[PDB]
């Protein structure tokens, strides 16, 4: 009969597991979620606060200590203003220790 014709068993029609797992990240995109909003140049530690920089830190170290040179094209006294100091490690003050 045609039932005994068509319903011969199939040993070895293993279903795939891979297209579902890849459509998951087609929708999601797992490492992509900082490649969406990161900007400019990659950088791990960039961050420090204003009291600690201006007061306790005593300001930038490798910059020009006295000279403020007036440039040619753009009309500006930059080499003090242009730095916007970012020297050294961030604000550490001894709380991770405690």
């Amino acid at each position: 009969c045609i039932y005994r014709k068509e319903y011969v068993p199939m040993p070895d029609h293993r279903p795939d597991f891979v297209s579902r797992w890849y459509s998951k990240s087609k929708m999601e995109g797992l490492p992509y979620k900082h490649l969406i909003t990161h900007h400019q140049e990659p950088s791990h530690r960039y961050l420090i606060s204003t009291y600690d920089d201006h007061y306790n830190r005593h300001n930038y170290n490798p910059g020009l200590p006295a000279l403020r040179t007036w440039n040619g094209q753009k009309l500006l006294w930059l080499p003090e203003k242009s730095d916007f100091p970012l020297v050294a490690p961030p604000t550490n003050y001894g709380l991770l220790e405690q």
Binding site: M27, E28, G29, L30, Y32, K33, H34, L35, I36, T37, H38, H39, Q40, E41, S43, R45, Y46, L47, I48, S49, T50, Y51, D52, D53, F84, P85, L86, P89, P90, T91, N92, Y93, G94, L95, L96
Partner: protein, 427 residues
């Protein structure tokens, strides 16, 4: 200096707070194993705002994580951040509501409210000093709009003193996703007015613009779009968590933004956006950030802001900056076009400062606005509403589990009188 209690519900909100509770984990240097491996001793300062403690030095959030379906709760703790969320802070049923507001607000989403009400007072009484309640959900279904906007009526029964802030998702204008949206959109807007203070309106047609026209990708999806909303969240409360020049908070924001008992509907933004090709060709300074945060193309709602006026405008800033270049460019933009502000208020733009941007940005901002072209989002619902009520279509999902027509015909007389307030002050 407070803590923050943050509520999440719906199939939406646990796919939005999944991105929210990991930027906060990024900015405080929180690894997904629970501990802290940040770099400074600045991040560890106000860790209490979002992170209770236990033994071993690990920090677990204040997360409330509720949904009728167990469909998405299998997906949020199967992410990278799975051992950072709380185990007994997943509250669920077995059935799913799915697009109706009867069995969210009265029966099937309702018996679990006593399983959300008695988890809040386990934690929100153990917090020493709270600023208020936050919520993120979608109005478009039956578990955010069914349970959360029910609970928004419930938790404001206890504490009237604190401040309700909301991260709502109104339905999109053009292409919608459900035939029964202008009921669940209609009934929860009339819910929101009495019991919420700064209601933020977010769309996905206005965000599928930004990942296309501005940031220039070719496959914008949800995970690409959930993160710009989750950039806004930590860009809001930047001064209760970090020092700066002029600190603001969620009670400083409400005084300078909402004048009125009823004129309290908002519109958000987020400033520094560009492509991935022009990453080094731009200069992230103040004359670039201010130039785009006021523009219509950089806005997270269905607002053309030129067609009306802003009564008020808020802001925040971050990053080691100076103040004169943020003193005059929000003074020029009030001056260069008086057409897009109303005359009877003397100032409009509030300025707030911090010291630190999100990790990777250099300087940041977050635009928050009380425009009166947000009434172009509540005209299309009331156009869609009464052009459905006139044929009385679909109303036997809405008499079948406990509501009447009198919960209906008064749920537009709040939407009419809202727009009847916003049109008085348009010119």
């Amino acid at each position: 200096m407070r803590e923050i209690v943050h509520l999440q519900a719906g199939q939406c909100g646990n796919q939005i707070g999944a991105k929210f509770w990991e930027v906060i984990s990024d900015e405080h240097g929180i690894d997904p194993t629970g501990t802290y491996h940040g770099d400074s001793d600045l991040q560890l300062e106000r860790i209490n705002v979002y992170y209770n403690e236990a033994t071993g030095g690990k920090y677990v959030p204040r997360a409330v994580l509720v949904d009728l379906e167990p469909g998405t709760m299998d997906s949020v703790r199967s992410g990278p951040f799975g051992q950072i969320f709380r185990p007994d802070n997943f509250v669920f049923g077995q059935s799913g509501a799915g697009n109706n507001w009867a069995k969210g607000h009265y029966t099937e989403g309702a018996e679990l409210v006593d399983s959300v009400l008695d988890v809040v007072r386990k934690e929100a009484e153990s917090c020493d000093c709270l600023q208020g309640f936050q919520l993120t959900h979608s109005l478009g279904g039956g578990t955010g709009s069914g349970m959360g906007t029910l609970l928004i009526s419930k938790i404001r029964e206890e504490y009237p003193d604190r401040i309700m802030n909301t991260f709502s998702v109104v339905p999109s204008p053009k292409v919608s996703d459900t035939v029964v949206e202008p009921y669940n959109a209609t009934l929860s807007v009339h819910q929101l007015v009495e019991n919420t203070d700064e209601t933020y309106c977010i769309d996905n047609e206005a965000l599928y613009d930004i990942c296309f026209r501005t940031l220039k990708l070719t496959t914008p999806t949800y995970g690409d779009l959930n993160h710009l909303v989750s950039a806004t969240m930590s860009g809001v409360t930047t001064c209760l968590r970090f020092p700066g020049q002029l600190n603001a908070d969620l009670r400083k924001l409400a005084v300078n933004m909402v004048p009125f008992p009823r004129l309290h509907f908002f519109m958000p933004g987020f400033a520094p956006l560009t492509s991935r090709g022009s990453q080094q060709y731009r200069a992230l300074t103040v004359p670039e950030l201010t130039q785009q945060m006021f523009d219509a193309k950089n806005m997270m709602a269905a607002c053309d802001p030129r067609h009306g006026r802003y009564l008020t405008v808020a802001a925040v800033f971050r990053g080691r900056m100076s103040m004169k270049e943020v003193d005059e460019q929000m003074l020029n933009v009030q001056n260069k076009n008086s057409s897009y502000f109303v005359e009877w208020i003397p100032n409009n733009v509030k300025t707030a400062v911090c010291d630190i941007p999100p990790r990777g940005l250099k300087m940041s901002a977050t635009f928050i606005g009380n425009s009166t072209a947000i009434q172009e989002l509540f005209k299309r619902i009331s156009e869609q509403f009464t052009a459905m009520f006139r044929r009385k279509a679909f109303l036997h999902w809405y008499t079948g589990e406990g509501m009447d027509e009198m919960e209906f015909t008064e749920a537009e007389s709040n939407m009419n009188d809202l727009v009847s307030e916003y049109q008085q002050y348009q010119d």
